[PDB]
Amino acid sequence: TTKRVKKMGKEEMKEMFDLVIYAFNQEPTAERQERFEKLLSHTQSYGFLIDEQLTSQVMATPFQVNFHGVRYPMAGIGYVASYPEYRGEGGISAIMKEMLADLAKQKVALSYLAPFSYPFYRQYGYEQTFEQAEYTIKTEDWPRVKRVPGTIKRVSWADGKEVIKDVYLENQRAHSGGVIRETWWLDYTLNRASKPNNQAIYYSSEGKAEGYVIYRIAAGTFEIVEWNYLTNTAFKALAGFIGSHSGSVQSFHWINGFAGKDLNDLMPTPAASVKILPYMMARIVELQTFLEKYPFQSGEKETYSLEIEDSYGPWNEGIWTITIDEQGKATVTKGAAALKADIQTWTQLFLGYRSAETLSFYERLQGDATIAQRLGQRLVKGMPILEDYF
Amino acid sequence: MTTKRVKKMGKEEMKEMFDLVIYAFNQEPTAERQERFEKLLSHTQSYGFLIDEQLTSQVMATPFQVNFHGVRYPMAGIGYVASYPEYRGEGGISAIMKEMLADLAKQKVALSYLAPFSYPFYRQYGYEQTFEQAEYTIKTEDWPRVKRVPGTIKRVSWADGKEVIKDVYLENQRAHSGGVIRETWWLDYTLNRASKPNNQAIYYSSEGKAEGYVIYRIAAGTFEIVEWNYLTNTAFKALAGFIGSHSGSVQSFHWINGFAGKDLNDLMPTPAASVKILPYMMARIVELQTFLEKYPFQSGEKETYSLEIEDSYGPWNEGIWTITIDEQGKATVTKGAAALKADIQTWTQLFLGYRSAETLSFYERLQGDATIAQRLGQRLVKGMPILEDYF
Amino acid sequence: MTTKRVKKMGKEEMKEMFDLVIYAFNQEPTAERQERFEKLLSHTQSYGFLIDEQLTSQVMATPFQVNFHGVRYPMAGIGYVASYPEYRGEGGISAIMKEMLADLAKQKVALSYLAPFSYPFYRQYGYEQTF
């Protein structure tokens, strides 16, 4: 009988943890329960009740993203779950409808998620905007690196977590739509007794932290869990530190954000096997907030007319005038050189995942290709990079 | 003791060259394969190393032209590098490389490409990886359904299709970042071989213009896309639905093409292709001055850079060059003044667009002020180079 | 600048050594594993290399007797040769192997055996494959 979408608090914790344990098939240990309580305390959960029974659920975690120097509010969507006996009741679609409306009411500008199925979330406005590079190299193929100035210390999480956070945020890879990571979020993702990592930090000869590796050895593989460096001599120092484990390992493995150029050619022999994995999908949530802050390249005052289609974001739908002044600043205005595209294509275009020239060729960005080209020269250059999972 | 010498080889040495190439690459001497060797030899300059007048090592340089962002450069494609095992350490390949690079520089060859069995082995002569390949493998059930679109597709014989396949290839954007300006004999040499036969189909638009082709074969349950080029989105969808029609007779589809920084997997509703990035050919600038005087720099304001080049096997490229890039593309290039310093490997990656000024500056291969490196990077060509030919 | 020295080790150095052996050989540090290492340590001569007074490398020699065609020979069985990965070419195992082979000859040991990770590596200190 009665169906309704409900905002969930920590009074509904046990209903939601039982849905997430079922949907994701995870053993409900005391550690996994307190990580879920920690995440619940930072997230907005939306539930779908049929006759007051929670049958589906979507969580929206609030993040800040660094997009080429601009702070954007970002909703990280995760734990999409529903019980199997409620097929066809329209639960996710009802949650997504209120949730997106809610996040717009809050002026959230962007939203990311890791899809079990791409078409399933593309129906709600999302589109692939992120890719990952998977490197695998045999232990005999890890290259020999000469020793270099500076020092590396292996480090407790307690003692290394604050230096690891600052090195990460200062890194230029963290500046293309990456998460601006909070202390709580870093502890939640990288400090798990169920699956423990080691950590080592590079310090310059002058004493400054210029890099770090987080790593584990499991099942004969050296897992490079994360590897960040701010200078070339931090890169070479840590590459030799990793390489030193080669005797206890049959291969090295690393998955990180792909932005169009892989690292295989930095070796004398390009011996890494390299795969490109589809990664998260994204969508512009509140389009006016997104374009008002957007860091356009500086140039001549230009004005554009954009038509948006967005069936789950009606507040984005219709024709906009955007005038981009000689600096990075745009004024955005509803009402009306027309260009036309769905919220999926505009999101790939503005986050920099595909170029206006390409999106014009494959006819997803409709309009005079020469006008698509002038707009493309005002946009951010280079693909967006995401090195966080949720 | 023994007479050692590098000789420029000709038709009269063909049999001694063929015997050495049959040994070094372990191929059986089919009369068909000697025919193909004679055809290549007549289009190539071979340099041999003779010890007491016996041919012991060889390198071949096939003269190609290359379309680099609108600019046509003479390129020497290097292949059939072969030495007999008894003459290890006698210095033959190195002796050939030194005389041959010098001769190719006399001819004002701008660029040289090769496919290496070993990257370190060719790096010592100034070559560096500057090309990559994307390998796609998709299961037959995962090939997407594509609605029928306007225009027609005809399956064609090689004789009826070769000159249209050449025009659509040369017209296609992906042929404009360092790719071979393919001559008719080279297209026949690579894409019409008795021993590895292909099918071909051309897409004509609704007004009759050839706007795409696929060259393909089916072997051991895999549909092999040997080559697929398209000038319009409607050509791309028509040919994609044509490759898709064979899905009921095949267990997977497989495609290796040149990689330029972005794979095609997202052009499907389900990005179900397995995508692997493969190391591909190496390249070097041969005659630096010819190369930079023709280079299509971005327009902007006049700037001058002094550049220092290390280049052991290209000593005519070495030293400090002053380069002044005017408000249009044009550079004037002078020797003997540096803000930026690199070895010819890094300058080749930089100027062909393989890596950025920023990246090569960060990893300390391009040395000098990072801000000067930044500004020279702004005058350079955009996007990675693409090669879709093998030799 | 950096201080470096070979030091003979003992019971007081136990956990510094156990933590190096757990890291280098990637084993879980259970109570059983620690008791057995405490047992082996009490029958072994152990050498360490300190750099700025931190243990960085380590070699153990267990005194065995060997039956060689009727003759008893004292043999030093070398094992748990371990280095932390922050240090490389600080000369640590080479400095240890020099002091330790000299100490073993002073004690009149006739033979040493070890399970090599690299044959070229221990062949530089005189060892050869014999088994």
mmCIF file of N, CA, C and O in Angstrom, chain A residues 118-119 122 127-128 131 172 229-233 235-236 258-270 273-276 278 348 353-354 361-364 383, chain B residues 119-120 123 128-129 132 173 230-234 236-237 259-271 273 275-277 279 349 354-355 362-365 384:
data_model
loop_
_atom_site.group_PDB
_atom_site.id
_atom_site.type_symbol
_atom_site.label_atom_id
_atom_site.label_comp_id
_atom_site.label_asym_id
_atom_site.label_seq_id
_atom_site.Cartn_x
_atom_site.Cartn_y
_atom_site.Cartn_z
ATOM 1 N N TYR A 118 26.532 1.115 -16.059
ATOM 2 C CA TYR A 118 26.582 2.473 -16.583
ATOM 3 C C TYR A 118 25.218 2.950 -17.072
ATOM 4 O O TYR A 118 24.814 4.048 -16.702
ATOM 5 N N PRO A 119 24.510 2.168 -17.893
ATOM 6 C CA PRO A 119 23.173 2.573 -18.326
ATOM 7 C C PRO A 119 22.205 2.789 -17.152
ATOM 8 O O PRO A 119 21.349 3.685 -17.192
ATOM 9 N N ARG A 122 23.151 6.400 -15.962
ATOM 10 C CA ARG A 122 22.971 7.344 -17.047
ATOM 11 C C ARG A 122 21.498 7.769 -17.169
ATOM 12 O O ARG A 122 21.227 8.903 -17.542
ATOM 13 N N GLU A 127 27.205 10.292 -16.283
ATOM 14 C CA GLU A 127 27.982 9.916 -17.430
ATOM 15 C C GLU A 127 29.374 9.634 -16.962
ATOM 16 O O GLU A 127 29.857 10.277 -16.034
ATOM 17 N N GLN A 128 30.059 8.676 -17.577
ATOM 18 C CA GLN A 128 31.433 8.420 -17.338
ATOM 19 C C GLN A 128 32.184 9.710 -17.561
ATOM 20 O O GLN A 128 32.017 10.355 -18.594
ATOM 21 N N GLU A 131 38.567 7.741 -15.539
ATOM 22 C CA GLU A 131 39.168 6.474 -15.985
ATOM 23 C C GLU A 131 40.294 6.090 -15.020
ATOM 24 O O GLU A 131 40.787 6.927 -14.306
ATOM 25 N N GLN A 172 49.584 18.057 -7.793
ATOM 26 C CA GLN A 172 48.833 18.693 -8.890
ATOM 27 C C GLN A 172 47.770 17.741 -9.435
ATOM 28 O O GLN A 172 46.749 18.178 -9.970
ATOM 29 N N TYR A 229 54.025 12.009 -5.254
ATOM 30 C CA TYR A 229 55.304 12.658 -5.158
ATOM 31 C C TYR A 229 55.216 14.089 -5.712
ATOM 32 O O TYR A 229 54.510 14.342 -6.687
ATOM 33 N N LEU A 230 55.901 15.050 -5.080
ATOM 34 C CA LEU A 230 55.909 16.462 -5.437
ATOM 35 C C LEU A 230 57.177 16.827 -6.211
ATOM 36 O O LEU A 230 57.236 17.892 -6.809
ATOM 37 N N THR A 231 58.225 16.003 -6.234
ATOM 38 C CA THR A 231 59.435 16.303 -6.968
ATOM 39 C C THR A 231 59.963 15.057 -7.645
ATOM 40 O O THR A 231 59.628 13.942 -7.260
ATOM 41 N N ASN A 232 60.810 15.181 -8.652
ATOM 42 C CA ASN A 232 61.453 14.041 -9.274
ATOM 43 C C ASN A 232 62.341 13.261 -8.325
ATOM 44 O O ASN A 232 62.438 12.053 -8.463
ATOM 45 N N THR A 233 63.043 13.856 -7.366
ATOM 46 C CA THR A 233 63.926 13.049 -6.514
ATOM 47 C C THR A 233 63.072 12.271 -5.447
ATOM 48 O O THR A 233 63.441 11.136 -5.099
ATOM 49 N N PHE A 235 60.069 10.909 -6.333
ATOM 50 C CA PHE A 235 59.728 9.837 -7.259
ATOM 51 C C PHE A 235 60.804 8.763 -7.355
ATOM 52 O O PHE A 235 60.511 7.590 -7.192
ATOM 53 N N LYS A 236 62.060 9.110 -7.614
ATOM 54 C CA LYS A 236 63.176 8.163 -7.719
ATOM 55 C C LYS A 236 63.502 7.492 -6.384
ATOM 56 O O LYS A 236 63.785 6.294 -6.348
ATOM 57 N N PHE A 258 43.771 7.825 -14.356
ATOM 58 C CA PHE A 258 44.358 7.973 -15.687
ATOM 59 C C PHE A 258 43.959 9.296 -16.281
ATOM 60 O O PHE A 258 42.759 9.566 -16.402
ATOM 61 N N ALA A 259 44.909 10.156 -16.672
ATOM 62 C CA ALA A 259 44.629 11.435 -17.339
ATOM 63 C C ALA A 259 45.264 11.493 -18.749
ATOM 64 O O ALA A 259 45.627 12.575 -19.237
ATOM 65 N N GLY A 260 45.393 10.376 -19.461
ATOM 66 C CA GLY A 260 45.695 10.386 -20.890
ATOM 67 C C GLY A 260 47.123 9.999 -21.202
ATOM 68 O O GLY A 260 47.466 9.787 -22.358
ATOM 69 N N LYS A 261 48.011 9.898 -20.226
ATOM 70 C CA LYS A 261 49.381 9.514 -20.465
ATOM 71 C C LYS A 261 49.798 8.571 -19.362
ATOM 72 O O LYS A 261 49.775 8.937 -18.211
ATOM 73 N N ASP A 262 50.186 7.338 -19.656
ATOM 74 C CA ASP A 262 50.626 6.389 -18.647
ATOM 75 C C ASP A 262 52.138 6.494 -18.401
ATOM 76 O O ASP A 262 52.861 7.073 -19.209
ATOM 77 N N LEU A 263 52.657 5.903 -17.323
ATOM 78 C CA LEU A 263 54.034 6.055 -16.851
ATOM 79 C C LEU A 263 54.969 4.962 -17.383
ATOM 80 O O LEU A 263 56.128 4.887 -17.015
ATOM 81 N N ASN A 264 54.530 4.096 -18.274
ATOM 82 C CA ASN A 264 55.335 2.982 -18.750
ATOM 83 C C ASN A 264 56.615 3.477 -19.400
ATOM 84 O O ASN A 264 57.650 2.850 -19.282
ATOM 85 N N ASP A 265 56.603 4.615 -20.072
ATOM 86 C CA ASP A 265 57.759 5.126 -20.816
ATOM 87 C C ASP A 265 58.836 5.765 -19.919
ATOM 88 O O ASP A 265 59.955 5.987 -20.371
ATOM 89 N N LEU A 266 58.579 6.078 -18.649
ATOM 90 C CA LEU A 266 59.627 6.527 -17.729
ATOM 91 C C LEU A 266 60.644 5.415 -17.461
ATOM 92 O O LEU A 266 61.744 5.700 -17.030
ATOM 93 N N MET A 267 60.332 4.134 -17.656
ATOM 94 C CA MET A 267 61.296 3.052 -17.525
ATOM 95 C C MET A 267 62.156 2.909 -18.786
ATOM 96 O O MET A 267 61.699 3.194 -19.888
ATOM 97 N N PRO A 268 63.396 2.456 -18.628
ATOM 98 C CA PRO A 268 64.241 2.109 -19.783
ATOM 99 C C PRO A 268 63.618 1.044 -20.674
ATOM 100 O O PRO A 268 63.722 1.130 -21.894
ATOM 101 N N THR A 269 62.960 0.034 -20.100
ATOM 102 C CA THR A 269 62.128 -0.933 -20.792
ATOM 103 C C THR A 269 60.674 -0.733 -20.361
ATOM 104 O O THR A 269 60.364 -0.894 -19.189
ATOM 105 N N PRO A 270 59.765 -0.396 -21.279
ATOM 106 C CA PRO A 270 58.346 -0.239 -20.898
ATOM 107 C C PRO A 270 57.687 -1.607 -20.621
ATOM 108 O O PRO A 270 56.929 -2.114 -21.446
ATOM 109 N N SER A 273 52.452 -4.079 -17.902
ATOM 110 C CA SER A 273 51.197 -4.267 -18.600
ATOM 111 C C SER A 273 50.206 -3.146 -18.172
ATOM 112 O O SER A 273 49.995 -2.955 -16.968
ATOM 113 N N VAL A 274 49.569 -2.393 -19.078
ATOM 114 C CA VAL A 274 48.757 -1.225 -18.706
ATOM 115 C C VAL A 274 47.305 -1.360 -19.189
ATOM 116 O O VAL A 274 47.053 -1.396 -20.365
ATOM 117 N N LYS A 275 46.302 -1.417 -18.334
ATOM 118 C CA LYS A 275 44.923 -1.450 -18.761
ATOM 119 C C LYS A 275 44.224 -0.166 -18.374
ATOM 120 O O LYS A 275 44.523 0.419 -17.343
ATOM 121 N N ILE A 276 43.266 0.316 -19.154
ATOM 122 C CA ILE A 276 42.483 1.469 -18.778
ATOM 123 C C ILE A 276 41.094 1.008 -18.405
ATOM 124 O O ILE A 276 40.386 0.357 -19.202
ATOM 125 N N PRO A 278 37.252 1.817 -17.055
ATOM 126 C CA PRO A 278 36.216 2.821 -16.816
ATOM 127 C C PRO A 278 36.119 3.040 -15.327
ATOM 128 O O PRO A 278 36.263 2.074 -14.561
ATOM 129 N N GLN A 348 30.667 15.954 -19.314
ATOM 130 C CA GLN A 348 31.934 15.543 -19.895
ATOM 131 C C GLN A 348 32.640 16.758 -20.486
ATOM 132 O O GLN A 348 33.846 16.878 -20.353
ATOM 133 N N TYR A 353 36.621 15.875 -19.711
ATOM 134 C CA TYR A 353 36.828 14.470 -20.033
ATOM 135 C C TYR A 353 36.886 14.243 -21.551
ATOM 136 O O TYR A 353 37.725 13.464 -22.030
ATOM 137 N N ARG A 354 36.017 14.864 -22.350
ATOM 138 C CA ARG A 354 36.147 14.843 -23.801
ATOM 139 C C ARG A 354 36.145 16.269 -24.290
ATOM 140 O O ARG A 354 35.594 17.161 -23.627
ATOM 141 N N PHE A 361 31.980 16.201 -33.175
ATOM 142 C CA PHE A 361 32.101 15.178 -34.225
ATOM 143 C C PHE A 361 31.087 14.059 -34.032
ATOM 144 O O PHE A 361 30.385 13.678 -34.974
ATOM 145 N N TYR A 362 30.951 13.505 -32.830
ATOM 146 C CA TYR A 362 30.069 12.361 -32.567
ATOM 147 C C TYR A 362 28.660 12.844 -32.301
ATOM 148 O O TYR A 362 27.816 12.080 -31.837
ATOM 149 N N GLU A 363 28.360 14.118 -32.584
ATOM 150 C CA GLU A 363 27.026 14.674 -32.674
ATOM 151 C C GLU A 363 26.306 14.637 -31.328
ATOM 152 O O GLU A 363 25.085 14.717 -31.259
ATOM 153 N N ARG A 364 27.014 14.577 -30.205
ATOM 154 C CA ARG A 364 26.395 14.700 -28.888
ATOM 155 C C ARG A 364 26.302 16.173 -28.532
ATOM 156 O O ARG A 364 25.390 16.596 -27.825
ATOM 157 N N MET A 383 42.162 16.070 -18.574
ATOM 158 C CA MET A 383 41.118 15.243 -17.998
ATOM 159 C C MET A 383 41.069 15.325 -16.486
ATOM 160 O O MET A 383 42.084 15.543 -15.821
ATOM 161 N N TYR B 119 63.998 -1.572 -26.438
ATOM 162 C CA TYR B 119 64.050 -0.132 -26.376
ATOM 163 C C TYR B 119 65.423 0.427 -25.983
ATOM 164 O O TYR B 119 65.876 1.404 -26.561
ATOM 165 N N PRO B 120 66.074 -0.151 -24.971
ATOM 166 C CA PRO B 120 67.428 0.261 -24.641
ATOM 167 C C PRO B 120 68.426 0.109 -25.814
ATOM 168 O O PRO B 120 69.347 0.938 -25.977
ATOM 169 N N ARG B 123 67.843 3.152 -27.971
ATOM 170 C CA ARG B 123 67.979 4.415 -27.264
ATOM 171 C C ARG B 123 69.404 4.934 -27.355
ATOM 172 O O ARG B 123 69.621 6.148 -27.457
ATOM 173 N N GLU B 128 63.800 7.324 -29.116
ATOM 174 C CA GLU B 128 63.072 7.252 -27.875
ATOM 175 C C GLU B 128 61.631 6.918 -28.171
ATOM 176 O O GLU B 128 61.096 7.316 -29.188
ATOM 177 N N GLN B 129 60.957 6.142 -27.339
ATOM 178 C CA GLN B 129 59.533 5.880 -27.502
ATOM 179 C C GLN B 129 58.748 7.181 -27.660
ATOM 180 O O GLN B 129 58.840 8.074 -26.827
ATOM 181 N N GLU B 132 52.337 5.048 -29.070
ATOM 182 C CA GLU B 132 51.690 3.964 -28.332
ATOM 183 C C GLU B 132 50.515 3.338 -29.136
ATOM 184 O O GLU B 132 50.002 3.933 -30.075
ATOM 185 N N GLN B 173 41.709 12.692 -39.837
ATOM 186 C CA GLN B 173 42.452 13.541 -38.886
ATOM 187 C C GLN B 173 43.540 12.773 -38.219
ATOM 188 O O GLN B 173 44.612 13.298 -37.963
ATOM 189 N N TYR B 230 36.984 6.690 -40.392
ATOM 190 C CA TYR B 230 35.690 7.264 -40.704
ATOM 191 C C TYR B 230 35.745 8.792 -40.678
ATOM 192 O O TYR B 230 36.342 9.367 -39.791
ATOM 193 N N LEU B 231 35.168 9.490 -41.652
ATOM 194 C CA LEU B 231 35.283 10.936 -41.747
ATOM 195 C C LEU B 231 34.069 11.580 -41.105
ATOM 196 O O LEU B 231 34.114 12.755 -40.777
ATOM 197 N N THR B 232 32.962 10.867 -40.882
ATOM 198 C CA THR B 232 31.760 11.445 -40.285
ATOM 199 C C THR B 232 31.202 10.536 -39.191
ATOM 200 O O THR B 232 31.530 9.346 -39.104
ATOM 201 N N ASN B 233 30.388 11.055 -38.290
ATOM 202 C CA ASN B 233 29.781 10.239 -37.254
ATOM 203 C C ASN B 233 28.817 9.257 -37.870
ATOM 204 O O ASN B 233 28.697 8.122 -37.450
ATOM 205 N N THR B 234 28.082 9.660 -38.880
ATOM 206 C CA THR B 234 27.179 8.783 -39.571
ATOM 207 C C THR B 234 28.010 7.679 -40.286
ATOM 208 O O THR B 234 27.618 6.537 -40.278
ATOM 209 N N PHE B 236 30.818 6.326 -39.060
ATOM 210 C CA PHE B 236 31.210 5.560 -37.887
ATOM 211 C C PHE B 236 30.078 4.642 -37.424
ATOM 212 O O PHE B 236 30.290 3.446 -37.169
ATOM 213 N N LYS B 237 28.854 5.133 -37.297
ATOM 214 C CA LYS B 237 27.738 4.312 -36.868
ATOM 215 C C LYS B 237 27.360 3.288 -37.923
ATOM 216 O O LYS B 237 26.972 2.174 -37.593
ATOM 217 N N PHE B 259 47.224 5.149 -30.302
ATOM 218 C CA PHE B 259 46.611 5.706 -29.140
ATOM 219 C C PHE B 259 47.006 7.166 -28.984
ATOM 220 O O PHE B 259 48.176 7.515 -29.077
ATOM 221 N N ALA B 260 46.066 8.071 -28.758
ATOM 222 C CA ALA B 260 46.338 9.498 -28.719
ATOM 223 C C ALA B 260 45.902 10.093 -27.378
ATOM 224 O O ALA B 260 45.819 11.307 -27.234
ATOM 225 N N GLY B 261 45.618 9.304 -26.356
ATOM 226 C CA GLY B 261 45.341 9.829 -25.024
ATOM 227 C C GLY B 261 43.946 9.503 -24.572
ATOM 228 O O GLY B 261 43.614 9.687 -23.400
ATOM 229 N N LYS B 262 43.073 9.004 -25.440
ATOM 230 C CA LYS B 262 41.703 8.771 -25.074
ATOM 231 C C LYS B 262 41.150 7.548 -25.809
ATOM 232 O O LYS B 262 41.102 7.515 -27.040
ATOM 233 N N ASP B 263 40.690 6.523 -25.103
ATOM 234 C CA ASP B 263 40.178 5.307 -25.741
ATOM 235 C C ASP B 263 38.720 5.459 -26.125
ATOM 236 O O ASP B 263 38.043 6.398 -25.704
ATOM 237 N N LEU B 264 38.201 4.543 -26.928
ATOM 238 C CA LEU B 264 36.871 4.611 -27.492
ATOM 239 C C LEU B 264 35.858 3.938 -26.564
ATOM 240 O O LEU B 264 34.660 3.977 -26.814
ATOM 241 N N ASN B 265 36.268 3.328 -25.457
ATOM 242 C CA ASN B 265 35.382 2.473 -24.681
ATOM 243 C C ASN B 265 34.151 3.230 -24.263
ATOM 244 O O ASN B 265 33.099 2.644 -24.146
ATOM 245 N N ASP B 266 34.190 4.539 -24.060
ATOM 246 C CA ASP B 266 33.034 5.294 -23.537
ATOM 247 C C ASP B 266 32.037 5.652 -24.636
ATOM 248 O O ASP B 266 30.888 6.028 -24.349
ATOM 249 N N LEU B 267 32.391 5.550 -25.914
ATOM 250 C CA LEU B 267 31.426 5.694 -27.001
ATOM 251 C C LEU B 267 30.358 4.582 -26.995
ATOM 252 O O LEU B 267 29.415 4.621 -27.787
ATOM 253 N N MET B 268 30.443 3.568 -26.138
ATOM 254 C CA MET B 268 29.384 2.596 -25.940
ATOM 255 C C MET B 268 28.579 2.934 -24.681
ATOM 256 O O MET B 268 29.114 3.534 -23.751
ATOM 257 N N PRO B 269 27.307 2.547 -24.644
ATOM 258 C CA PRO B 269 26.511 2.652 -23.419
ATOM 259 C C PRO B 269 27.091 1.814 -22.282
ATOM 260 O O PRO B 269 26.966 2.187 -21.105
ATOM 261 N N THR B 270 27.685 0.654 -22.569
ATOM 262 C CA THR B 270 28.427 -0.133 -21.594
ATOM 263 C C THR B 270 29.882 -0.188 -22.063
ATOM 264 O O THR B 270 30.182 -0.738 -23.122
ATOM 265 N N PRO B 271 30.786 0.407 -21.295
ATOM 266 C CA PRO B 271 32.181 0.426 -21.676
ATOM 267 C C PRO B 271 32.786 -0.965 -21.438
ATOM 268 O O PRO B 271 33.657 -1.153 -20.582
ATOM 269 N N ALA B 273 34.638 -2.957 -23.463
ATOM 270 C CA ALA B 273 35.868 -3.367 -24.143
ATOM 271 C C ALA B 273 36.964 -3.466 -23.117
ATOM 272 O O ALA B 273 37.093 -2.613 -22.229
ATOM 273 N N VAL B 275 40.599 -2.662 -22.651
ATOM 274 C CA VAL B 275 41.537 -1.733 -23.326
ATOM 275 C C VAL B 275 42.944 -1.806 -22.718
ATOM 276 O O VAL B 275 43.138 -1.511 -21.557
ATOM 277 N N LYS B 276 43.955 -2.170 -23.480
ATOM 278 C CA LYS B 276 45.325 -2.300 -23.036
ATOM 279 C C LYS B 276 46.188 -1.297 -23.809
ATOM 280 O O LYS B 276 46.027 -1.163 -25.006
ATOM 281 N N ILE B 277 47.090 -0.541 -23.183
ATOM 282 C CA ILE B 277 47.960 0.403 -23.886
ATOM 283 C C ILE B 277 49.308 -0.226 -24.170
ATOM 284 O O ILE B 277 50.005 -0.658 -23.267
ATOM 285 N N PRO B 279 53.252 -0.234 -25.714
ATOM 286 C CA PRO B 279 54.417 0.507 -26.217
ATOM 287 C C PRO B 279 54.530 0.306 -27.716
ATOM 288 O O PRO B 279 54.286 -0.801 -28.203
ATOM 289 N N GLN B 349 60.616 13.661 -28.099
ATOM 290 C CA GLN B 349 59.353 13.512 -27.395
ATOM 291 C C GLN B 349 58.637 14.832 -27.226
ATOM 292 O O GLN B 349 57.411 14.905 -27.359
ATOM 293 N N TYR B 354 54.732 13.915 -27.772
ATOM 294 C CA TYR B 354 54.560 12.714 -26.952
ATOM 295 C C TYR B 354 54.327 13.056 -25.483
ATOM 296 O O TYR B 354 53.381 12.576 -24.902
ATOM 297 N N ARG B 355 55.183 13.841 -24.829
ATOM 298 C CA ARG B 355 54.958 14.325 -23.465
ATOM 299 C C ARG B 355 54.933 15.842 -23.487
ATOM 300 O O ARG B 355 55.337 16.468 -24.460
ATOM 301 N N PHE B 362 59.296 18.300 -14.999
ATOM 302 C CA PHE B 362 59.114 17.745 -13.663
ATOM 303 C C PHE B 362 60.014 16.552 -13.441
ATOM 304 O O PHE B 362 60.717 16.479 -12.439
ATOM 305 N N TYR B 363 60.046 15.594 -14.362
ATOM 306 C CA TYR B 363 60.904 14.422 -14.272
ATOM 307 C C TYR B 363 62.345 14.756 -14.662
ATOM 308 O O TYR B 363 63.149 13.834 -14.858
ATOM 309 N N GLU B 364 62.710 16.048 -14.771
ATOM 310 C CA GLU B 364 64.076 16.568 -14.945
ATOM 311 C C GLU B 364 64.786 16.057 -16.210
ATOM 312 O O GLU B 364 66.010 15.943 -16.239
ATOM 313 N N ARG B 365 64.071 15.762 -17.291
ATOM 314 C CA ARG B 365 64.666 15.454 -18.589
ATOM 315 C C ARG B 365 64.867 16.712 -19.425
ATOM 316 O O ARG B 365 65.851 16.841 -20.159
ATOM 317 N N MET B 384 49.141 13.975 -28.861
ATOM 318 C CA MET B 384 50.164 12.997 -29.116
ATOM 319 C C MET B 384 50.207 12.610 -30.584
ATOM 320 O O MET B 384 49.190 12.634 -31.276
#
